[PDB]
Amino acid sequence: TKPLDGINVLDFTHVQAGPACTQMMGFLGANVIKIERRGSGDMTRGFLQDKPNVDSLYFTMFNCNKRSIELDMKTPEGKELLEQMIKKADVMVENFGPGALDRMGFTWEYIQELNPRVILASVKGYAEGHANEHLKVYENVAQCSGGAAATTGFWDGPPTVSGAALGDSNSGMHLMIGILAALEIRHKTGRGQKVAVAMQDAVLNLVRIKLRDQQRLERTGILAEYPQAQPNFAFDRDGNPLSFDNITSVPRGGNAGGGGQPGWMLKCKGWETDADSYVYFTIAANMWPQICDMIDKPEWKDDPAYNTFEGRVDKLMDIFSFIETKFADKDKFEVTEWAAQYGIPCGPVMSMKELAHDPSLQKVGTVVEVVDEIRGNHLTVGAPFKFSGFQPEITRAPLLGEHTDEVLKELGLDDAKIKELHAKQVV
Amino acid sequence: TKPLDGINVLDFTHVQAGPACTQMMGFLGANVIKIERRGSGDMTRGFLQDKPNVDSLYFTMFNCNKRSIELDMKTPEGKELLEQMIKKADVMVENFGPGALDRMGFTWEYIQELNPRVILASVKGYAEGHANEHLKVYENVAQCSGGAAATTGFWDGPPTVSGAALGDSNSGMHLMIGILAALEIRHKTGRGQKVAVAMQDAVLNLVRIKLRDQQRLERTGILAEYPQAQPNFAFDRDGNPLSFDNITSVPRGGNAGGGGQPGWMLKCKGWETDADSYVYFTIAANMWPQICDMIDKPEWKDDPAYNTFEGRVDKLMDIFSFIETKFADKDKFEVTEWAAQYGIPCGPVMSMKELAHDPSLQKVGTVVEVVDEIRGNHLTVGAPFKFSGFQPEITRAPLLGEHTDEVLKELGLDDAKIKELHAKQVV
Ligand code: NA
């Protein structure tokens, strides 16, 4: 028994945000019917393919546990089909532009008329009511709109995008929270709701720690845990000093700790010829004696220039630089093992190659080999929530229109009618 | 009616990941009782305070819509009190070290006996059964473990952390999905489950697109949309040109498009003195004619060297450099409007200062002013999901043990018993 067994999802989504939401629902047991445009379908199918005329890894890794039906929703027969499907549905998920679904003939009011129990879930770029609510947002545009780009990277370089899908998949996971919340009250009210997530808002949620920083900066004029708080440390491209004297918006802090304890990205053996030969090393305020033992600096234990966070503000980047010299002949795994002996939070920069072939992630079901006889097997990320009572069973992504007839038969249509729909090119 | 009205949460969490989960449940109506250590409580209270002896902004921005009780769980009386609270709870939430809750007297097995309906939810560093299951993980350590640092930043720079809480808040939002899914299944089964989210796995879920890229690279030996795919553009430390000939793990691509169309971060007027005077500019394949119009390059519309993705691969960075020269005397909002009249979605980098005081975000309830009559008002981020049926009502964060006696009275304790517990230093 899986959490969303019996939950029927009408899935209009494409690209990444929406599809990530409905795929993860499918991993938890939902019956996901992906409605695709006749003859082309989700643009990810043909987006950066690795084999010619085979659905891409972009498509397969975001569309497992779904069935595909092709539908021309601009036809009268298509609209009648939708109406029938909505009456069988628990959740409708879409990421069209503002007002698109209303123009297709299906307002929220009309949807409620068709099915009082159906939840309507949307991914948007900007929140409804925002000055910016209508225009488009790709992955990195949301990262920029939500404060992530401005606070990511280095003080002497540009705003920097995250490799993680802070815009797309993050918004999809946020929409999943919204949909599940709507399911929970429906047990009381018996009624579906409209739920929407703007990509800017999903990013801003994760950037909450930097809105803390903005207020601290306004109130106090300094962020003591940032590199720029160290006198004479940070400079711009042209050699101008960067101190909090002149800083009015949360700056980029390089590899500083964020919402963690102070930390830094330190080089390990092989860093010149291996881009990922680094650890993240933390200096937790309650672990200074342990650190002093590790690096053989007993004289730093009782010295007030070193043994409080306040004392270290003027030299912390010097301390990271010295710690780094201890790792010069050790790889990242052996530095991680060394720090762990002291209980010091520290871990490796894992490469994508290391992650793809890691035995442990395959053991726990986080990296999963999907069985696909048509395209060949591939890896995907599984469910990142682990449950005592069940396990996902991940199955291959559908071919375009693979399940059209199967789905129409479930709506009780006879063979003659299915033949008519094909002949009319409705399906 | 709010989704989680009547859901009683026994909240052991501290720092960021756990508290972000329980706060957002509170925003959706949950009754959150935060169990804190007598005398000190959640470390965020005293972490980077902006005023002496006043709860920090880290604390207040992650602990609205909660009540605080102080409890010594090392005492037999405290353990008995916990047993009573567990019997009235729907969800227990924790982010202690591995085994820590077992050691304080409450194994999953014991918990099930006390209350067959209760859900136990945990934030972990690595998943149960992982080779690294006993490693301590916070924020940037998790960004490193889950593939984000390896794939964020520049090819000639270090692995780079996101300013967004990819580790902590992201893991908390993933746990909330798990909890809501456990509630769904409990409606059918009548039984609670154990759910857990590892920070590595929450990060890797958002890094799915780079696991796409790792398989593409292994299968084909190139990622055509990356800057390194342009011959003689990207160089290493020593001045040698990088190419995918010798790249076997997904590299850092600077400000390339990720899951979006090809893009780059482009300077606008004032970039030397304003760190956030930038726009993200996307070159979507079927927008090339509009882009040619915008930048007055009519020759490029019909030239096969320029008018397809494939043709642009050997010079895309040159094209970006050229487009950037057109923005040198325009600010990021002027550039965005100029692109928008050609139908081109361009995105400004929003500073934290701009976001904190943006009218629109306060209009839609995404940035919210909390009325805090104890500490003075502050801003926070609200619910990033917007519902037709209700609005969150955000109330200020609790003082340490502010609600101890209130909570004990709800358990059925009389004033004499409560007085005894205070005297014995159990609360
Ligand atoms: Na030593």
Side-chain angles (χ1 to χ4, degrees):
Chain A
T1 292
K2 305 185 202 280
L4 306 179
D5 284 342
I7 294 297
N8 300 123
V9 182
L10 285 185
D11 181 13
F12 302 87
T13 65
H14 45 92
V15 196
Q16 182 177 163
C21 180
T22 62
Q23 178 183 63
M24 192 60 59
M25 284 181 77
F27 288 2
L28 296 200
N31 164 221
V32 182
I33 300 169
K34 185 183 180 66
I35 298 165
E36 294 186 81
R37 200 211 287 253
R38 246 195 106 258
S40 50
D42 199 331
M43 70 78 54
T44 60
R45 291 175 176 285
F47 195 16
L48 294 163
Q49 295 169 307
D50 55 280
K51 277 228 195 179
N53 197 226
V54 181
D55 292 319
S56 77
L57 286 153
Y58 205 163
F59 175 81
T60 61
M61 294 180 71
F62 283 89
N63 292 280
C64 290
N65 293 47
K66 299 177 188 185
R67 291 189 287 158
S68 177
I69 178 159
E70 284 171 296
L71 193 60
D72 186 345
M73 288 168 52
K74 294 164 181 176
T75 70
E77 296 87 357
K79 294 201 201 319
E80 183 54 59
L81 256 18
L82 265 204
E83 285 184 20
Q84 291 173 254
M85 290 185 280
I86 290 169
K87 288 177 187 295
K88 309 279 263 83
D90 292 289
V91 191
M92 304 172 61
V93 191
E94 62 98 11
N95 66 81
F96 295 126
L101 224 202
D102 298 339
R103 289 189 291 276
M104 293 165 186
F106 294 88
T107 61
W108 171 234
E109 287 71 39
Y110 187 57
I111 292 162
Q112 286 180 285
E113 191 185 312
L114 294 167
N115 191 351
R117 294 183 56 70
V118 77
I119 295 158
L120 174 59
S122 301
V123 185
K124 302 159 156 75
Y126 283 88
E128 188 176 45
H130 207 111
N132 220 121
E133 69 159 80
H134 294 291
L135 59 80
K136 287 59 64 208
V137 176
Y138 292 91
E139 167 66 51
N140 290 341
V141 172
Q143 292 200 27
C144 291
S145 76
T151 62
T152 301
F154 279 77
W155 51 85
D156 62 341
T160 301
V161 305
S162 170
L166 293 179
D168 289 2
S169 286
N170 174 44
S171 298
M173 291 307 90
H174 275 81
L175 194 59
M176 191 168 173
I177 299 171
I179 293 165
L180 288 173
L183 287 173
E184 180 66 2
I185 36 149
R186 189 177 70 156
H187 283 99
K188 287 142 78 181
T189 68
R191 295 302 303 265
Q193 269 189 99
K194 203 156 66 274
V195 61
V197 172
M199 296 165 75
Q200 183 184 33
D201 294 0
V203 177
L204 224 328
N205 190 219
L206 297 195
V207 172
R208 181 188 297 273
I209 200 71
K210 303 298 180 186
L211 178 59
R212 175 206 66 164
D213 291 350
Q214 184 57 34
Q215 294 179 88
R216 292 170 53 216
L217 177 59
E218 288 162 359
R219 292 176 178 203
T220 75
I222 198 175
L223 306 169
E225 85 283 11
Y226 276 61
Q228 297 94 324
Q230 181 170 319
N232 314 131
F233 174 74
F235 300 88
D236 77 3
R237 245 164 282 192
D238 306 316
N240 296 303
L242 295 174
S243 75
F244 278 100
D245 292 352
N246 304 306
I247 292 168
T248 56
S249 196
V250 178
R252 292 179 280 282
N255 283 320
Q261 291 290 305
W264 206 248
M265 199 76 65
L266 302 189
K267 288 159 175 176
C268 296
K269 187 179 63 176
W271 69 268
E272 300 96 334
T273 66
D274 177 359
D276 301 334
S277 196
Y278 292 76
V279 297
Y280 202 79
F281 190 90
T282 68
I283 296 175
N286 71 324
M287 303 189 69
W288 187 247
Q290 296 96 303
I291 292 159
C292 289
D293 278 353
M294 187 180 177
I295 68 182
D296 288 312
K297 287 283 171 174
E299 63 266 43
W300 287 1
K301 284 188 179 164
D302 299 334
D303 187 341
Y306 288 93
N307 73 4
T308 63
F309 166 83
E310 292 79 9
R312 290 187 299 268
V313 170
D314 70 5
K315 59 172 63 63
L316 186 63
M317 305 314 303
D318 294 318
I319 294 160
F320 283 125
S321 163
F322 184 69
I323 292 166
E324 183 170 59
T325 70
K326 308 301 179 178
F327 305 160
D329 306 325
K330 293 185 184 189
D331 75 31
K332 63 193 181 190
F333 304 110
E334 59 212 6
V335 170
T336 295
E337 180 174 343
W338 189 22
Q341 286 186 321
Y342 292 83
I344 293 162
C346 168
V349 167
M350 293 294 288
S351 77
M352 293 315 305
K353 179 160 62 169
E354 287 165 329
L355 291 173
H357 308 291
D358 175 48
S360 285
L361 288 168
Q362 283 157 26
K363 184 197 167 179
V364 305
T366 297
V367 176
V368 177
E369 184 176 13
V370 183
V371 178
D372 190 330
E373 293 297 326
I374 295 167
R375 310 183 185 91
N377 294 6
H378 67 94
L379 305 179
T380 198
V381 183
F385 356 83
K386 310 305 184 185
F387 299 86
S388 54
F390 81 95
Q391 226 119 111
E393 293 171 297
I394 300 171
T395 55
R396 69 153 177 87
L399 302 176
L400 182 60
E402 182 177 352
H403 303 94
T404 293
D405 286 5
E406 192 172 290
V407 165
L408 294 173
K409 269 102 166 259
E410 285 172 358
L411 299 178
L413 282 73
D414 61 40
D415 288 344
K417 181 60 181 169
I418 293 172
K419 175 156 170 35
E420 191 193 319
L421 291 170
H422 283 285
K424 290 180 147 292
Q425 298 182 338
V426 175
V427 129
Chain B
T1 318
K2 306 189 199 292
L4 303 176
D5 279 331
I7 298 296
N8 302 311
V9 180
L10 193 52
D11 180 17
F12 297 97
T13 65
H14 58 292
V15 197
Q16 186 176 156
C21 182
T22 60
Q23 180 179 240
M24 196 59 63
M25 290 177 73
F27 289 180
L28 300 197
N31 168 220
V32 182
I33 305 181
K34 184 181 179 76
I35 309 304
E36 292 191 79
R37 206 221 203 78
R38 252 186 106 258
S40 46
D42 195 329
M43 70 81 57
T44 57
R45 288 179 180 284
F47 194 24
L48 297 158
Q49 292 165 305
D50 59 287
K51 283 153 174 132
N53 310 305
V54 174
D55 294 316
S56 81
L57 281 155
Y58 203 164
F59 178 78
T60 63
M61 293 182 73
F62 287 91
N63 297 279
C64 286
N65 293 54
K66 301 180 189 173
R67 288 187 294 164
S68 175
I69 180 162
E70 285 175 281
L71 199 55
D72 194 349
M73 295 179 287
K74 284 134 74 160
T75 66
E77 294 87 357
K79 290 181 169 56
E80 173 53 55
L81 275 175
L82 216 58
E83 290 193 7
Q84 294 188 249
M85 294 174 97
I86 290 167
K87 288 174 175 299
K88 298 204 155 87
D90 292 285
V91 187
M92 299 167 68
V93 195
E94 65 101 3
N95 63 264
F96 299 119
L101 194 62
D102 288 358
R103 291 191 303 267
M104 60 193 75
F106 298 91
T107 69
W108 171 231
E109 290 68 34
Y110 194 64
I111 291 167
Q112 286 183 105
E113 197 210 302
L114 294 165
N115 188 349
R117 291 181 54 78
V118 78
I119 296 160
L120 176 64
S122 311
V123 182
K124 293 166 183 307
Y126 286 91
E128 191 175 7
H130 200 295
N132 285 336
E133 64 188 321
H134 301 309
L135 292 187
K136 301 175 187 191
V137 179
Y138 309 97
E139 190 52 63
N140 291 341
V141 177
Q143 300 199 19
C144 292
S145 69
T151 59
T152 298
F154 282 77
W155 50 86
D156 57 350
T160 306
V161 304
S162 174
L166 250 176
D168 287 9
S169 278
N170 177 46
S171 293
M173 294 302 98
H174 279 78
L175 193 59
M176 185 169 182
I177 293 177
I179 290 168
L180 291 171
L183 285 175
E184 260 307 281
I185 209 175
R186 186 174 70 157
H187 283 289
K188 20 169 159 265
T189 72
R191 292 295 299 275
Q193 278 191 35
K194 194 202 299 100
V195 62
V197 168
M199 291 168 164
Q200 185 188 30
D201 296 3
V203 169
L204 191 53
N205 189 37
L206 300 194
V207 171
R208 186 185 297 269
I209 195 71
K210 304 302 184 183
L211 184 56
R212 175 200 69 156
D213 292 352
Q214 180 59 31
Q215 296 177 88
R216 289 170 59 204
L217 180 60
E218 287 178 13
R219 291 175 180 197
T220 72
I222 195 162
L223 304 170
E225 84 283 18
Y226 275 61
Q228 295 92 331
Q230 178 169 319
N232 319 301
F233 168 81
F235 300 94
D236 71 22
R237 209 155 288 103
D238 88 80
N240 287 4
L242 300 170
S243 81
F244 279 100
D245 290 358
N246 306 304
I247 294 185
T248 58
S249 191
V250 182
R252 294 184 277 286
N255 284 323
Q261 293 280 318
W264 203 248
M265 199 74 67
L266 304 189
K267 292 159 173 174
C268 297
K269 188 192 173 199
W271 68 268
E272 298 98 326
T273 54
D274 175 1
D276 304 334
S277 195
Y278 290 77
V279 294
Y280 198 80
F281 195 90
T282 298
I283 299 177
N286 51 40
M287 213 78 81
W288 188 246
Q290 293 92 317
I291 293 165
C292 288
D293 286 342
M294 189 196 176
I295 74 183
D296 197 40
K297 278 285 185 183
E299 325 94 271
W300 287 355
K301 292 164 114 290
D302 305 305
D303 189 346
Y306 284 85
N307 70 6
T308 72
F309 171 83
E310 291 85 17
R312 289 187 297 266
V313 176
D314 68 355
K315 61 185 145 297
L316 189 58
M317 303 311 310
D318 303 347
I319 294 166
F320 280 126
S321 294
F322 180 74
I323 293 181
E324 189 170 52
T325 67
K326 257 83 158 66
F327 304 164
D329 197 58
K330 302 181 188 297
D331 71 34
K332 63 197 185 192
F333 303 110
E334 291 171 326
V335 168
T336 298
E337 283 197 5
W338 176 30
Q341 55 200 35
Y342 295 84
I344 301 165
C346 186
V349 171
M350 299 293 293
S351 69
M352 292 308 307
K353 180 171 71 184
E354 288 169 318
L355 293 167
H357 310 290
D358 177 56
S360 290
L361 286 167
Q362 286 172 57
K363 283 197 254 185
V364 302
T366 291
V367 172
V368 178
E369 187 179 338
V370 184
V371 182
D372 186 328
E373 81 288 357
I374 302 300
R375 310 187 187 82
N377 291 3
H378 67 90
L379 305 164
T380 199
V381 178
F385 7 77
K386 315 297 186 182
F387 302 79
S388 55
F390 84 97
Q391 220 89 357
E393 292 185 285
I394 299 171
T395 56
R396 67 140 178 101
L399 295 166
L400 178 64
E402 191 179 353
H403 305 93
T404 291
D405 295 351
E406 189 176 301
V407 170
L408 289 168
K409 284 195 188 75
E410 293 177 347
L411 292 176
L413 308 208
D414 54 63
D415 297 344
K417 225 301 173 179
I418 293 170
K419 275 172 164 46
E420 192 213 316
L421 295 165
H422 278 269
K424 208 173 290 188
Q425 312 204 332
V426 176
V427 305

